[PDB]
Amino acid sequence: HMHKKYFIGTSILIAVFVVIFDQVTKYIIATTMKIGDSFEVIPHFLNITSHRNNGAAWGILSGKMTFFFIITIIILIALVYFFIKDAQYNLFMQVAISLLFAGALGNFIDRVLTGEVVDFIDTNIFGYDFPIFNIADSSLTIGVILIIIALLKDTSNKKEKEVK
Ligand SMILES: CCC[C@@H]1OC(=O)[C@@H](C)C[C@H](C)CCCCC(=O)CCC[C@@H](CC)/C=C\C=C(/COC)CC[C@@H](O)[C@@H](O)C[C@H](O)CNC1=O
Ligand SMILES: CCCCCCCC/C=C\CCCCCCCC(=O)OC[C@H](O)CO
Ligand SMILES: [Zn+2]
Ligand SMILES: [Zn+2]
């Protein structure tokens, strides 16, 4: 065969699709809804409630926009470095890095523009009394799950031969 080093076209489409979907949903919630309003999509399981977060996960480190600014630039540059140096010929890793990149960039735009993050996903399917999050948060969590899956799987991949 002819194996490929960088699935760059797929990785860009993935990141572009997530950031567009994240920014549009954030905009229409902040435009067509007041804070505290709640709409019902799946009763008792999923609602859309306008919410604002000036901090990180679970509202930790609230009001530290300079810290979020620096640490997100470090993350974005680190993801680009690992894409080129350690993820070549690995489509699974390149997809996970793109989801991490899109998620970090999505929340980074909100903090730079407004100094806070719009959150509207209000559900209990992934656990009860779970904080209200957004699409950028979902992409981040998803990419982290794939990263730990790939590396945990390769702990059991130490087998000498590669051909029958
Ligand atoms: C999830 C990415 C968090 C995201 O970090 C970001 O921005 C990126 C750029 C990096 C941060 C600046 C650095 C913090 C370290 C990560 C952290 O904090 C602990 C890790 C727990 C987490 C990962 C395994 C699982 C569960 C959390 C949540 C559930 O996610 C579905 C939180 C959803 C609601 O708290 C919602 O209000 C959050 C709000 O939207 C702002 N978003 C952020 O801060
Ligand atoms: C938790 C939500 C906040 C977001 C925090 C994101 C921080 C992640 C930073 C870099 C990840 C880059 C992943 C690079 C994966 C490649 C690992 C690798 O190749 O290392 C091989 C080594 O030999 C095996 O130990
Ligand atoms: Zn009912
Ligand atoms: Zn909050």
Author numbering: -1, 1 to 163
Quote the paper.
The pathway in Gram-negative bacteria employs the prolipoprotein diacylglyceryl transferase, Lgt, to dagylate the pre-prolipoprotein, LspA to cleave off the signal peptide from the proliprotein and the apolipoprotein N-acyltransferase, Lnt, to perform a final N-acylation step. LspA is essential in Gram-negative bacteria, it has no mammalian equivalents and its active site is accessible to potential drugs at the outer surface of the inner membrane. The enzyme consists of four transmembrane helices (H1-H4) with the catalytic dyad aspartates, Asp118 and Asp136, towards the membrane’s outer surface. Extending away from the catalytic dyad and to one side of the bundle of transmembrane helices is the β-cradle, a hemi-cylindrically shaped sheet that sits on the membrane.
Overall, the structure of the protein in the myxovirescin complex is very similar to that of the complex with globomycin. Differences were noted at the C-terminus that was fully formed as an extended helix in the myxovirescin complex but was disordered, and without useful electron density in the globomycin complex. The similarities do not end there. Tracking along the myxovirescin molecule from the 6-OH to the [-4NH-3C(O)-] amide linkage we find the latter hydrogen bonded to the catalytic Asp136 and to Arg110. By contrast, in complex with LspMrs, myxovirescin assumes the shape of an ovaloid disc bent at its broad end.
